């Protein structure tokens, strides 16, 4: 079975630094089959070689006896292990800009898992130059096949929003809610101490920002824009995404709490460094996150557990690897 | 006067472990007339002999002078007595499974009472084999007569939900809110210490789980399913029912508070073991519950009082004997 | 100018103890003109002589310099004075029952005032025997004239509710929201210590109920019923009205707070006994209340001030003299 | 490009003390270009000479490095400077009344700015005598041109509200929400200690009212009325505006918090006297305010920062220079 990834292209295209993004959420597959799963593309644009490389993850799972009706003596516990994951959406510093000038795609996937099954979400970031050739491509991810379909919308220059064409910025002024996708870029630096700005933007009891994760989020808005670096103090679009990421960390019911839990991240930690909540339910939100209390990014994969993403206390928390939401942008309709 | 109990049957039936359930809420009858009241059925499936047996209840009533306009010197008090109740929905361990293999029905009633009148709710759990003979039956409960009516819905295999047929699980994926009925099964065991899981799933200040009631809930979903044991950690449907039971204990206005009260459960208790709220109003929620702070189940019958079912403090609380609500199930429409 | 007071009568009338009530809210009149204002009726049913008698009130007003833009040195203060008010809705014990057997009306008025103007609300309680003669009457209250108009609704026995006829109690069961009017009856007695029941029904920090006002509320529901004594523990209709009175004391925007204030009730009190809130705005809620902390009822008239009617702390509070609202009653539509 | 300022006039006009007001919000202009910006009118009514005079402002800006993705080592700071602003809506005592008797207009502007751009809002208060000549005028404000357009509505005497004509006060009684514009008049006086009334009307922890700003607000309601002095204790319209000003100080999304900040007002203050919140976003609310903790009005201009206008703690707060909102007025429709 094949699934479609629609990437919208306007009639008028500006070349220079614009990248477009498409995504598709795939049906659930067993957790064991996600090992060594990597995107395999057949487009004329070679995928970036760094995405297929290994990223060390700390895998956190929960387990228990769980007999019918059993509420006690379950031996409910969490297990931390070091695992190698390839193809996840771990973007490196200046990878999007280099991929634009190299005409290379960025094809990666997110994992939304419970204890037994995973919903992969395949992402592809391609330069705007893919909006003229518009050659249909085929991507293989595990047992699934994805057809990249470029569609030329009836919009002249803007974004297709509910059958209307909105130009983020010559009509009258208007505000539109525009979709945005963000990825955390792990990069050490004295200017990238992220939680120093988390402490200023939000009512966050967050001490010791010197020892917390360093990096920034990079975002694509409207499915077609220049990359937005988050946070950027004098860029209100960037600060809107910053607000959305930390006020809605799972992104913008089948979820029942099994119990709270703590885990060692990484596995070699002398004490528990991450708080999580074990749950039962169909896969929903991402299982990929980054440990807060480590300058060097410790990537976490917690199938069946929701890591603590609330920032009101930075203790034993995490930040999401990917984030999707809506931000309000000024402009006009055409 | 006769009342109908509709039990829906699909055109395609799977035999193996499926049981169907029907219920009907009967008009109010005086409290004194509910004594020795037992279901009397005329079906081809003999009712389970254990339901008509005696279950010891602690009866908690409230009383006062209550002259017109009298607000003081009412001698407002509660009285605890040991009473024998037959035919209430007290299911034993593995009773539903044995009744399936024996082709026996489980006919029982719940009591929703105020100080003077009771609304009986008659339940019947029959094996799926009653969805082919579909012989109309007659059940007598006190002054009421109930006609069991099996109706073959136009659904192929699924459940009739608002004129649509939903198959809980080959169309597209969808989520549907499905009705569910649950009964507390009292059974001693080191794996059935229920409040050990209540403490983990909910923000519940609940100490000393060793001395609290032991057992599990058994549920039928969609009016047609295999029994669901609650809680089951790796069964998200079971954990959804678990969440609904303890977040909405009365199930999913004519109710005025007369005053808080405490009662000895059982009557021989040296101190008060249960907190309740005396009320005035037409009968609404169930008057049957089980004392929390006793490993051996102490069944409580409190006409005119609502027992403390909130779990945020397990002190002097109770759990419901029966629970009806809605849970979200994955599947498709046919 | 003349105003209408519609009193609805059903086609079928039950004689025995039923009284009907009508009311009309009159336009604002200057506060000084309300002195010695008494209802003057021209019906064939003589008004009860006790209503036109004097009831001692403690009058609480507020004053200040109040120059344009003046926010300081206003000398904002309250003044307590003993005044004689006639014709207000001060019902005596068993007055409604005696008026029924005597075929006498109870004609009285409520006062909703700000600092300068008053909205009188004229009430009339007549026995059900006024629903057959149905002779149109004329009542004079100050500068206003009121025509009592009896209208035979198309209802057989029930109450006209939104064009439908509801019979509070042979159709199917249903719940209807029914209008109700209540009056506080001041009567000393060891069974009428009202706040002893306020403490039990509501989460009310209310100590020393021995020294608080004694009496009960008497109510007419549906504009046609036997009198309902409030509170009556085993009468859920009575307890619904009890709940409405103390949860919605002003009854079931042009109101700006000038400032909190305390007053001596009665004027001879050695210290402040009542808390109030001075306001500016068009007349809205009643200015008549009864002091809480005095077994002998101290009637309060506070034009331009809202007395503390919240019961969460009984300190320096009051209770309303009259209350209008809605309660849910069981019955059927005809 | 020219923008319209519509000023509605009724068919019947009452001369005596009525003034009408119009306003227009202009597109954003760079912050540097707002210096020395003054309204230049071409009407037959000369603008009041005091508006074009200099008012000393304390200018509070925020700055930081703000590289793409930079969250730390931004050197985020605020800078206070003394600047001269002409033409802002700083009304003097009795200026509106003197302008009425002198047939002079009051033309001024408000500034809603972020760190880089400003939205000017041009106001004009003219005597009611401008509703007969109705000569179209031209006003120049910076790079913008404004055409004053007087329109004779189809209302006889009232205000045009959603296509209907409401007469604030011979039809039936009714309540209408009416627009109102208010300006803070700074005037020293023992009767103008504003926060003495703020403390009484609102639950405000506000000590030391002797050392807080002195003055009052002056308002025009319905775009046509006699001036309303705020607060006026016995004027419920005035107290409604008083409530709206302090409950909705910004008046009756593109706003992301960069961080809290404190500033010295005036620049010569030995310690920080004003709390603000630095933000990023398109210009929205006014950047003009008055320092609370100084009897002599200290006008503040904080482009890109929202001054603390919440009154629950008067510490380091401010009050708005201008306020627009809605108040409920009694009257009738014609
Ligand atoms: C995990 O998700 C799958 C697919 O939705 C579901 O079938 C399975 O029961 C889930 N496991 C849990 C909730 O433990
Ligand atoms: C109990 O319920 C019956 C039936 O609804 C009602 O008639 C009776 O008044 C109630 N008793 C109370 C509320 O004390
Ligand atoms: C009192 O009410 C009258 C009538 O609504 C009104 O005209 C008057 O201004 C009010 N006085 C106040 C609010 O002080
Ligand atoms: C200020 O507002 C202008 C106009 O809306 C906008 O272009 C600019 O980015 C804003 N500056 C910020 C938010 O720092």
């Amino acid at each position: 079975n094949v699934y479609d990834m629609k990437i919208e292209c306007p009639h008028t295209v500006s070349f220079g630094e614009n990248s477009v993004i498409g995504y598709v959420e795939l049906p659930p597959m067993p957790l064991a089959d996600t090992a060594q799963m990597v995107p395999e593309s057949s487009c004329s644009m070679d995928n970036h070689q760094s995405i297929n490389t290994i990223t060390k993850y700390t895998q956190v799972i929960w387990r228990g006896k769980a007999d019918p009706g059993q509420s006690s003596q379950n031996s409910f516990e969490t297990v931390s292990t070091e695992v190698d994951l390839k193809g996840t959406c771990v973007l490196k510093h200046k990878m999007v800009e280099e991929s634009y000038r190299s005409r290379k795609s960025i094809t990666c996937y997110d994992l939304s898992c419970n204890s037994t099954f995973c919903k992969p979400t395949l992402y592809m970031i391609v330069p705007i130059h893919a909006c003229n050739m518009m050659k249909s491509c085929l991507i293989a991810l595990g047992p699934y096949r994805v057809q990249v379909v470029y569609e030329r919308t009836y919009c002249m220059t803007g974004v297709l929003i509910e059958g209307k064409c909105f130009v983020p910025d010559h009509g009258i002024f208007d505000i539109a809610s525009v979709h945005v996708v963000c990825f955390f870029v792990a990069v050490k630096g004295n200017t990238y101490k992220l939680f120093e700005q988390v402490k200023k933007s939000f009512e966050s009891t967050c001490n010791d920002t010197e020892n917390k994760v360093q990096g920034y989020y990079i975002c694509i808005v409207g499915g077609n824009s220049a990359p937005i670096y988050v946070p950027t103090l004098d860029d209100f679009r960037s600060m809107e995404a910053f607000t959305g990421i930390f006020k809605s960390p799972h992104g913008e019911a089948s979820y029942s709490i099994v119990g709270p839990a703590n885990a060692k991240v990484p596995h070699s930690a002398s004490s528990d460094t991450l708080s999580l909540i074990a749950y039962s339910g169909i896969p929903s939100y991402s299982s990929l996150s980054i440990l807060t209390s480590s300058t060097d990014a410790k990537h976490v994969f917690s199938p069946g557990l929701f890591p603590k993403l609330n920032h009101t206390n930075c203790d034993k928390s995490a930040i999401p690897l990917t984030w999707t939401g809506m931000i309000d942008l000024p402009g006009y309709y055409e």
Side-chain angles (χ1 to χ4, degrees), chain A:
Chain A
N1 203 335
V2 61
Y3 305 87
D4 286 352
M5 176 188 297
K6 296 169 56 61
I7 295 181
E8 299 177 355
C9 296
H11 269 76
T12 296
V13 156
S14 300
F15 301 93
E17 63 182 293
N18 292 269
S19 293
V20 293
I21 187 176
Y23 58 89
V24 51
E25 185 175 355
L26 295 172
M29 57 182 295
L31 169 61
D33 294 3
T34 63
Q36 270 65 31
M37 182 178 60
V38 291
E40 303 179 13
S41 182
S42 300
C43 330
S44 58
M45 315 177 67
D46 178 65
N47 186 22
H48 201 278
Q49 73 287 348
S50 177
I51 298 300
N52 296 326
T53 58
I54 289 182
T55 291
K56 294 202 306 176
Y57 275 79
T58 294
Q59 182 181 87
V60 181
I61 60 103
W62 71 266
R63 59 184 181 182
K65 192 61 178 60
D67 279 339
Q70 177 176 11
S71 55
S72 51
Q73 300 191 356
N74 285 279
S75 297
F76 172 74
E77 64 173 348
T78 48
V79 185
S80 298
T81 53
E82 297 301 277
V83 300
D84 293 331
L85 297 192
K86 302 180 300 181
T88 66
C89 291
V90 178
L91 274 56
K92 269 64 185 301
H93 185 59
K94 301 185 64 60
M95 175 183 290
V96 176
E97 293 80 1
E98 290 166 3
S99 295
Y100 180 88
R101 288 177 281 99
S102 304
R103 306 298 154 82
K104 299 180 61 180
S105 67
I106 299 181
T107 306
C108 63
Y109 65 90
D110 187 10
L111 287 178
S112 301
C113 309
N114 66 5
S115 290
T116 55
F117 285 88
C118 287
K119 286 184 180 181
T121 301
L122 180 63
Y123 293 94
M124 195 180 71
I125 304 177
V126 287
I128 192 57
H129 299 74
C131 278
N132 40 77
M133 45 180 62
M134 294 177 59
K135 297 175 172 57
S136 182
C137 179
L138 204 284
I139 301 181
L141 182 68
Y144 306 115
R145 300 295 177 269
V146 174
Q147 177 183 11
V148 180
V149 176
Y150 294 93
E151 183 168 355
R152 185 81 72 185
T153 68
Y154 50 86
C155 301
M156 295 183 297
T157 64
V159 185
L160 185 59
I161 296 181
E162 297 183 3
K164 306 180 66 177
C165 296
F166 179 79
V167 182
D169 203 325
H170 296 61
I172 64 122
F173 175 84
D174 199 351
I175 295 292
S177 181
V178 185
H179 194 262
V180 53
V181 184
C182 298
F183 306 88
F184 179 73
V185 181
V187 44
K188 298 286 296 301
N190 292 330
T191 67
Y192 297 132
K193 300 181 182 182
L194 180 67
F195 277 79
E196 185 165 323
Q197 185 54 46
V198 173
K199 184 178 178 181
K200 281 192 282 294
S201 291
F202 313 102
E203 306 303 320
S204 175
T205 305
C206 203
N207 300 277
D208 190 13
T209 57
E210 292 296 282
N211 293 123
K212 287 173 172 46
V213 63
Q214 297 177 2
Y216 58 84
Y217 285 87
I218 190 167
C219 308
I220 304 295
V221 311
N224 176 23
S225 69
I228 304 302
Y229 283 66
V230 174
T232 301
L233 299 190
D234 61 352
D235 188 334
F236 72 92
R237 313 168 303 171
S238 172
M239 298 308 295
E240 284 176 356
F242 189 69
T243 302
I245 288 175
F246 285 88
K247 285 191 179 179
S248 309
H250 289 93
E252 296 177 35
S254 180
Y255 155 66
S256 301
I257 294 180
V258 172
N262 295 317
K264 297 177 176 182
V265 176
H267 175 58
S268 63
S270 306
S271 64
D272 293 326
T273 54
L274 176 63
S275 294
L276 311 91
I277 292 180
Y279 72 91
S280 287
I282 66 182
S284 52
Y285 302 112
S286 173
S287 301
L288 304 179
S289 59
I290 297 98
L291 189 69
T292 288
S293 60
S294 177
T295 65
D296 298 319
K298 303 301 178 181
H299 293 83
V300 179
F301 173 47
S302 61
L305 301 98
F306 284 143
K308 178 187 175 185
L309 302 179
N310 198 325
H311 60 69
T312 178
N313 191 342
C314 283
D315 160 60
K316 291 195 260 61
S317 73
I319 63 175
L321 176 62
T322 63
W323 181 86
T324 59
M326 315 280 293
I327 60 177
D328 295 358
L329 299 184
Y332 62 96
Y333 289 95
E334 60 184 6

